[PDB]
């Protein structure tokens, strides 16, 4: 239903144990030295 100005899709490859870290409010090597999701978010992490 909704409408917005743009949708930003970012893509990475992280090993399974670290998929938890790419979320809001997580700390570790991946979310602190490599990619940091903002504290507030409206988005859907998807991993296969």
């Amino acid at each position, epitope marked *: 239903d909704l409408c917005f100005t743009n949708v930003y899709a970012d893509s990475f490859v992280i090993r399974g*144990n670290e998929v938890s870290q790419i979320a809001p409010g997580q*700390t*570790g090597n991946i979310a*602190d*030295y490599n990619y940091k999701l903002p504290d507030d978010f409206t988005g859907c992490v998807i991993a296969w």
Partner: antibody
Amino acid sequence: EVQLVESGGDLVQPGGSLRLSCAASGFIVSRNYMSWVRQAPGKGLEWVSSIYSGGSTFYAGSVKGRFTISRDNSKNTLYLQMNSLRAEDTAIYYCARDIPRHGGDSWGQGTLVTVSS
Amino acid sequence: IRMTQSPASLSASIGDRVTITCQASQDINKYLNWYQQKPGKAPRLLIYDASNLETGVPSRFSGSGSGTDFTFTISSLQPEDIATYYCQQYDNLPITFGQGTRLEIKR
């Protein structure tokens, strides 16, 4: 030489607050991974806390909210503020620098904490 | 991880071939370090990653493993080798050590 005189602590009543201090020879504390192991007398070493190169703090289950870790840029001296102690925390505490994957280590001689009544 | 070391009293004569086995409860891949703690003196790091012995060590200690079960070997048992060896995994946040295998010498 990476030699550590991590020497602080001797003992307090149950419910006290002790302050450890570590120290540093070739490196700077705030740039390398460091952690604090805990060796009870006659028992396998157990892991209490760990700091990262950007300030991330991780604790153990038994020390959630009683223990604190803190890193001091000015004089090395990785600080570990023991608070809300008890009568089963008696163990030898070793300061430890762990470079994560490339492999070197410092475990300093370590200090004794016997906290009792 | 429920780290498991199977030999705790193992006693070999001068110059023998022994082996220590540290076992885990999940796949830790290759991130398991082998330590050596002499009596009183602070532990030393002997084999980081489970497959790399640190430089400056004598060249007898070798270790190899992957996934759950790991093994530690001693090639020449010099008399000045009495200590307690520990296996540590350093990438799962609840870092759990092993029990130690107190090694002694027989004569």
